[PDB]
Chains A and B, each alone.
Chain A
Amino acid sequence: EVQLVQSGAEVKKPGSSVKVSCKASGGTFSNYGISWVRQAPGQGLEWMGRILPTFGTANSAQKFQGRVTITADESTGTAYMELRSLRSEDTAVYYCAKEGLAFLGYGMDVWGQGTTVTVSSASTKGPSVFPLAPSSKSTSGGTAALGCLVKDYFPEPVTVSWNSGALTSGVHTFPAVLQSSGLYSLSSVVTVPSSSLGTQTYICNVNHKPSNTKVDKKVEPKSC
């Protein structure tokens, strides 16, 4: 059961350089053939190139020529896939997987874990929490939905919990969307019976790890 421990998330800036590692859990290498696969956010997979660790051979896809440089270190069993001249669209989740010392046939079977590599041009920014009041309390007389909008934060992720995680029924968390400016935003709403309104207090909390912020917005009705 060969494992492939991979690096961690690395936010970078346009035009910079990145270096992802695919250390093989177990020691040194063998008759491998590790190859690198890139997956854009919410898209299909995309092959990049492969390396032969022990036999000392590597190449990249024709589209990535002159930009990707795959190297291996058989002493420690670690393969690197340094990428230079990072573009704005190169943000993706980069994988590494072994495919047998060959070129055609078997196909990759043991994968790493993914290394998110968001490339942009903005420093960490606190997320501005804004409450969405349960407006128009006349939908169906017994159902209501309310949430708190999280806007202009960077970078991912930001977990959202309601009442310190004491409520999960009818709770949604939409995926973050990259705005034109370059900051992320996501909503999080909860469906609550109209009877509970005006009697139970709901507070949503956020936890932006890079900016270590703990906000607590207590949602309110329209305040007459």
Chain B
Amino acid sequence: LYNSASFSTFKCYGVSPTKLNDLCFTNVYADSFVIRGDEVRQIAPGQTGKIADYNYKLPDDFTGCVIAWNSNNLDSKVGGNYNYLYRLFRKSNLKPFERDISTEIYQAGSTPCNGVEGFNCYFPLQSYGFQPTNGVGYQPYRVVVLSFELLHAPATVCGPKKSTNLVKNKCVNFNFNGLTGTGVLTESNKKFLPF
């Protein structure tokens, strides 16, 4: 993921990028959505606005990692791509890592709405005018948000750090599956059992 040269916004806060494959984590979550350019900034941990407030709120004590790369070739067709919605009205804010897909007509005023839009009663959702010809900042940005939790379960995802060759007949340091030591390694004639 790091040496990809194709991700615009490979940056994240909880942990260092170089030590990702150094810690064995629990079951990593992965989120996915498409968003404009102006607000990839507020997908970061701890911001407020329109999308960070009613759509996808990220906790302050965040330890995941955030991805964002431009795709103005797959999610943008002539005449617009009226297939990517986003809520812009809500009773209150949104707790971190919360999902809401209800489509009850939002009531800004103090009058009954009877499930039909009218005076001071707006529809909750809104579409994206993803025209193929827009300035940068209006083009779609596919975003992936990761999350690393320290669950009391032992671990489920380690890192593929490294494995090197072995040189025999020398006094060298070694480490086999956590069993370290020093000495000289030579071929044996034992009768190990499979386990």
Contacts and interface: CB of A to CB of B under 8 A. Distances in A.
Contacts of B117: 57, 59, 103
Contact of A101 (B79, B82, B122): B82
Interface stretch (B124-132, B138-146, B148-156): B124-132
B123 interface: yes
Interface string B106-121: 0000000000111100
A105 interface: yes
B85 to A, nearest CB: 6
A106 interface: yes
A173 interface: no
Of A1, A58, A100, chain B has the most CB atoms within 10 Å of the CB of A100
A104 interface: yes
B127 A100 contact: yes
Contacts of A52: 123
A55 interface: yes
Interface of A is mostly: loop
Nearest to B103: A55
Given A1-B78, A30-B82, A30-B83, A101 B116 contact: no
A106 B105 CA distance: 19
B114 to A, nearest CB: 10
A217 B103 CA distance: 66
A102 B123 contact: yes
A31 interface: yes
A24 to B, nearest CB: 12
Interface string A76-116: 00000000000000000000000011111110001000000
A62 B116 CA distance: 13
Nearest to B121: A103
Nearest to A61: B118
Nearest to A30: B82
Given A31-B127, A55-B103, A59-B117, A103 B82 contact: no
B161 to A, nearest CB: 46
A103 B122 contact: yes
Contacts, number: 44
Interface residues of A, number: 20
Contact of B82 (A59, A62, A100): A100
Interface of B is mostly: loop
B85 A31 contact: yes
Interface in A189-211: none
A101 B85 contact: yes
A2 interface: yes
Interface string A1-13: 1100000000000
A110 B131 CA distance: 14
Contacts of A62: 119
Contacts of B122: 103-104
A150 B52 CA distance: 67
B55 to A, nearest CB: 15
Contacts of A55: 103, 125
B107 to A, nearest CB: 13
Nearest to A29: B82
Interface string A56-77: 0111001000000000000000
A58 B85 CA distance: 19
B81 to A, nearest CB: 9
A105 B118 CA distance: 16
Interface of A: 1-2, 30-33, 52, 55, 57-59, 62, 100-106, 110
15 contacts: A1-B79, A31-B82, A57-B117, A57-B123, A59-B118, A62-B119, A100-B82, A100-B126, A101-B85, A101-B125, A101-B126, A102-B123, A103-B122, A104-B122, A106-B129
Given A31-B83, A59-B117, A101-B85, 7 more contacts: A33-B127, A52-B123, A55-B125, A101-B123, A101-B127, A104-B122, A106-B129
Per CB-CB distance, the 8 closest pairs between chain A and chain B, nearest first, are A31-B82, A101-B127, A102-B126, A31-B127, A30-B82, A100-B127, A103-B123, A103-B122
